Amino acid sequence: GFWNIVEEDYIPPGYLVGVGYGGAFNLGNPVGLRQHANPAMQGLRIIAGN
Amino acid sequence: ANRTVSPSTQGVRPAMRQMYNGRNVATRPIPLIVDTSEIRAIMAAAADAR
């Protein structure tokens, strides 16, 4: 039909995930990503120990 | 000579065209009927939901 079908083992066996994009409603990627408000808190960081 | 006449012989060549056959192709588009009331209902809801 209208589904583009992707083979992906990171989806577990016995699950279907359907996602829409674009159109008149302008759908986008489903999950919003939040970083910490402090600039020093952002990314993976390596820190000196005690 | 042969003097034979008919509505065909005196007439005009038919204005014939070819339909969408839906044959001798690999794929046929999904027939997706969409009336102008549906386009307005989609477009208006997309505007209201933005």
Automatic annotation (TrEMBL), chain A:
Superkingdom assignment: Viruses
Protein name: Capsid protein
From TrEMBL, chain B:
Superkingdom assignment: Viruses
Region (Disordered): 1-20
Annotated Polar residues bias: 1-11
Name of protein: Capsid accessory protein
Organism taxonomic ancestry: Viruses, Duplodnaviria, Heunggongvirae, Uroviricota, Caudoviricetes
